[PDB]
Design an enzyme around this catalytic site. Structure first.
Site, mmCIF file in Angstrom:
data_model
loop_
_atom_site.group_PDB
_atom_site.id
_atom_site.type_symbol
_atom_site.label_atom_id
_atom_site.label_comp_id
_atom_site.label_asym_id
_atom_site.label_seq_id
_atom_site.Cartn_x
_atom_site.Cartn_y
_atom_site.Cartn_z
ATOM 1 C CE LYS C 49 -2.794 -2.277 3.526
ATOM 2 N NZ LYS C 49 -3.000 -3.561 2.800
ATOM 3 C CD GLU C 95 7.937 -1.239 -3.558
ATOM 4 O OE1 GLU C 95 7.437 -0.441 -2.737
ATOM 5 O OE2 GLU C 95 8.061 -2.458 -3.321
ATOM 6 C CG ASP C 99 15.768 -1.435 3.811
ATOM 7 O OD1 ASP C 99 16.997 -1.247 3.716
ATOM 8 O OD2 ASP C 99 15.177 -1.502 4.910
HETATM 9 N N1 LIG Z 1 7.112 2.009 6.567
HETATM 10 C C1 LIG Z 1 8.483 1.713 6.363
HETATM 11 N N2 LIG Z 1 8.815 0.559 5.827
HETATM 12 C C2 LIG Z 1 10.131 0.220 5.603
HETATM 13 C C3 LIG Z 1 11.121 1.152 5.968
HETATM 14 N N3 LIG Z 1 12.327 0.574 5.644
HETATM 15 C C4 LIG Z 1 12.115 -0.619 5.121
HETATM 16 N N4 LIG Z 1 10.783 -0.855 5.085
HETATM 17 C C5 LIG Z 1 10.134 -2.096 4.567
HETATM 18 C C6 LIG Z 1 9.963 -2.026 3.027
HETATM 19 N N5 LIG Z 1 9.530 -3.330 2.512
HETATM 20 C C7 LIG Z 1 8.074 -3.306 2.350
HETATM 21 C C8 LIG Z 1 7.502 -4.685 1.887
HETATM 22 N N6 LIG Z 1 6.159 -4.869 2.432
HETATM 23 C C9 LIG Z 1 5.357 -5.745 1.527
HETATM 24 C C10 LIG Z 1 5.777 -5.535 0.059
HETATM 25 O O1 LIG Z 1 5.197 -4.668 -0.635
HETATM 26 C C11 LIG Z 1 5.499 -3.544 2.559
HETATM 27 C C12 LIG Z 1 3.930 -3.644 2.381
HETATM 28 P P1 LIG Z 1 3.136 -1.975 2.598
HETATM 29 O O2 LIG Z 1 3.655 -1.040 1.553
HETATM 30 O O3 LIG Z 1 1.639 -2.091 2.457
HETATM 31 O O4 LIG Z 1 3.476 -1.439 3.955
HETATM 32 C C13 LIG Z 1 10.168 -3.583 1.276
HETATM 33 C C14 LIG Z 1 11.584 -3.042 1.300
HETATM 34 P P2 LIG Z 1 12.859 -4.264 0.689
HETATM 35 O O5 LIG Z 1 13.794 -4.587 1.831
HETATM 36 O O6 LIG Z 1 12.191 -5.528 0.224
HETATM 37 O O7 LIG Z 1 13.649 -3.661 -0.463
HETATM 38 C C15 LIG Z 1 10.718 2.422 6.562
HETATM 39 O O8 LIG Z 1 11.669 3.389 6.944
HETATM 40 N N7 LIG Z 1 9.424 2.645 6.730
HETATM 41 MG MG LIG Z 2 6.844 -0.765 -0.762
#
Ligand SMILES: Nc1nc2c(ncn2CCN(CCN(CC=O)CCP(=O)(O)O)CCP(=O)(O)O)c(=O)[nH]1
Ligand SMILES: [Mg+2]
Ligand SMILES: Nc1nc2c(ncn2CCN(CCN(CC=O)CCP(=O)(O)O)CCP(=O)(O)O)c(=O)[nH]1
Ligand SMILES: Nc1nc2c(ncn2CCN(CCN(CC=O)CCP(=O)(O)O)CCP(=O)(O)O)c(=O)[nH]1
Ligand SMILES: Nc1nc2c(ncn2CCN(CCN(CC=O)CCP(=O)(O)O)CCP(=O)(O)O)c(=O)[nH]1
Ligand SMILES: [Mg+2]
Ligand SMILES: [Mg+2]
Ligand SMILES: [Mg+2]
Ligand SMILES: [Mg+2]
Ligand SMILES: [Mg+2]
Ligand SMILES: [Mg+2]
Ligand SMILES: [Mg+2]
Lengths: 175, 181, 174, 176
Positions: C49, C95, C99
């Site tokens: 999201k 995106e 990370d």
């Molecule tokens: N809210 C937030 N989230 C963070 C942060 N850093 C890493 N993440 C997690 C990001 N994650 C999010 C993955 N996760 C499911 C995939 O879409 C997020 C679902 P969402 O967007 O609905 O919250 C991917 C980063 P990567 O390590 O795979 O490249 C941050 O500072 N804030």
């Molecule tokens: Mg994301």
């Protein structure tokens, strides 16, 4: 071999002459500021870009701890400000040349409004028109005539800064 | 001595630094020997403030071809905020041949950000010259054309390198007494 | 007034919109003559999201026709899949943050096996591990440190997505 | 400077008209849920109906001063294509649509979501057509518009024109 063949008309100050005077200046500056009391190092505020070669050699010639600051101003506006708070600091303005004194007059007013402990000025070159200005210069490397010079930081259209000496340009350069 | 007791040991003496820089200057001079005659423009040195200031003034004087000075500063990875330009270039580098001049490459994060930012301005060429390189730079992804010295991971100061803005004015590079750091 | 768990503001609303305008114009120049040749619009694949606010502002900043598609993946499986076939289409993955690069790596592999004409990536934020891993990303809004951030789609346990800004979450809760 | 040169015949609602109205809706929704959300300590859930309501909900959520959370759903034309990843039992839920016309989508979705027994359910649509001014109570209506087919701001014709910052009508040549 000449770095810019045919471009330099005559030599005003050799590299040896510049370094010898900088050695003298550093010792004099070190004398006047000899941080033991205040607990904070002498702050060198360099006016980019012409004063960069001067300040690196000068700082190595100053026998007391010094810190580096860099500013850039236009022909009244700031392009590049301090990353520093100079409140209560001993500050030394480092310039390459004082001519009309307009840049220095502006820079002095700006820095002194930041309430430093002290403010002094060190310029490598001073040209005759600086007489008509009214900002005291504690340290002057050389007094030179009114001619346009380049080298050792001093540029013409961003060129000739890399020269180890200071000299005048062949008239053909301006064309 | 400038900082009585603060320096534990000397890693690189003043003469050793100057001697190596003379070698670097000549090498760079050879690689860009025909630049000014061919393109009509000089080699552009982009100095990353503040650590690389002493390096670039000695380096440029050691380079036997015309060089131009530009300066910039970028923020730290550290809350340091987003990586950003604190001080920008004065001139446009479009179509220019550019050499990034750094004091040290360690993690390589700063160089990666810089390389991406400067490349998007479309210079004719983009290469890197660093005085020092630490072991962790092996994992970095930006090609480095010129390295002065490979040094251990230990924290060093002097010749532009600071600890809390101090020690930049040393003519040599040394390690710090743990009382300080 | 900021929510109590906001330590500081990483990016204001104005900073975000300013950068998006730059990205939008850049994306437009990259796809303008291309889209005119294929006769098909640039496809924006949003990763739910977190990237939902980003993609609506981005699409309105891109001066060429763009179409919306939405996907949602787990933390391995596909929760929401694409509604249309992307065969021979020009696709831009949108995106919020890259990370570790794990999510992007999985999505790229999954989408390239559908044979689009082009598959490129646009993220608002990037953390240093993505730089270390040398993850290929065409468009990056901001490089940021490792600190956990919320706002503008970014969440902490589904909260704070509705903030117009991106703030550093108070370390007293994470 | 037109995204779709010659395709838009007229502009029904300008970008600043839509944003001005959203700012009002956000303030109204905020006042209606301020004290209400503080009693449960749980945020208002914005359930978005893909794809048309996406532009609307991102601007609306930023206009709502009380904390909100995002959910997304997709339905056919009635069955569920994308379902809720989340149980909404005892939650305060606000359905967010782009346009209500016949009301058949809203009617079906409203009863489907109330069967999950939220603490409170309300509907917010940006646009409402005359045959929808009539099954489900709509507390928040952005604009009452005529029956004419419009595109822009999430509203599509054959998946195009969603990205328009405004809402307008197409030139009849587009339907070819
Ligand atoms: N809210 C937030 N989230 C963070 C942060 N850093 C890493 N993440 C997690 C990001 N994650 C999010 C993955 N996760 C499911 C995939 O879409 C997020 C679902 P969402 O967007 O609905 O919250 C991917 C980063 P990567 O390590 O795979 O490249 C941050 O500072 N804030
Ligand atoms: Mg994301
Ligand atoms: N290269 C060179 N420059 C000269 C000369 N005389 C005055 N100038 C102008 C030096 N400066 C020019 C100011 N200018 C912008 C302000 O910082 C210098 C920027 P730069 O050091 O990057 O070349 C005026 C000093 P003043 O008239 O205010 O006292 C000269 O002989 N050679
Ligand atoms: N003084 C000192 N600094 C060290 C050292 N090792 C890494 N660093 C950090 C140098 N830099 C710090 C970057 N930092 C802001 C970027 O311009 C330097 C600002 P400065 O030159 O004014 O000190 C990191 C390079 P990297 O990890 O991204 O490749 C060291 O031994 N001494
Ligand atoms: N683009 C556009 N669409 C219009 C319009 N009028 C009714 N509709 C149909 C909107 N919707 C279409 C439903 N349809 C599938 C259900 O979510 C919308 C999917 P979409 O948002 O991806 O386009 C019917 C509402 P209702 O008749 O049940 O009350 C119009 O003027 N423009
Ligand atoms: Mg000057
Ligand atoms: Mg000049
Ligand atoms: Mg550095
Ligand atoms: Mg440092
Ligand atoms: Mg999340
Ligand atoms: Mg709808
Ligand atoms: Mg539709």
């Amino acid at each position: 071999a000449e770095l810019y063949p045919g471009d330099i008309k005559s030599v005003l100050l050799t590299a040896e002459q510049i370094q010898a005077r900088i050695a003298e200046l550093g010792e004099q500056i070190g004398n006047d500021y000899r941080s033991a009391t205040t607990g904070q190092d002498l702050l060198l505020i360099t006016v980019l870009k012409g004063a960069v070669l001067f300040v690196t050699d000068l700082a190595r010639a100053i026998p007391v701890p010094t810190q580096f600051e860099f500013m850039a101003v236009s022909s009244v506006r700031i392009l590049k400000d301090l990353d520093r708070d100079i409140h209560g600091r001993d500050v030394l303005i480092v310039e390459d040349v004082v001519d009309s004194g307009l840049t220095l007059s502006w820079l002095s007013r700006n820095l002194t409004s930041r309430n430093p402990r002290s403010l002094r000025v060190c310029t490598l070159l001073r040209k005759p028109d600086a007489v008509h200005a009214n900002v005291e210069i504690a340290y002057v490397g050389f007094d030179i005539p009114n001619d346009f010079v380049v080298g050792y930081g001093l540029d013409y259209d961003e060129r000739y800064r890399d020269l180890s000496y200071i000299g005048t340009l062949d008239p053909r350069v301006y064309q």
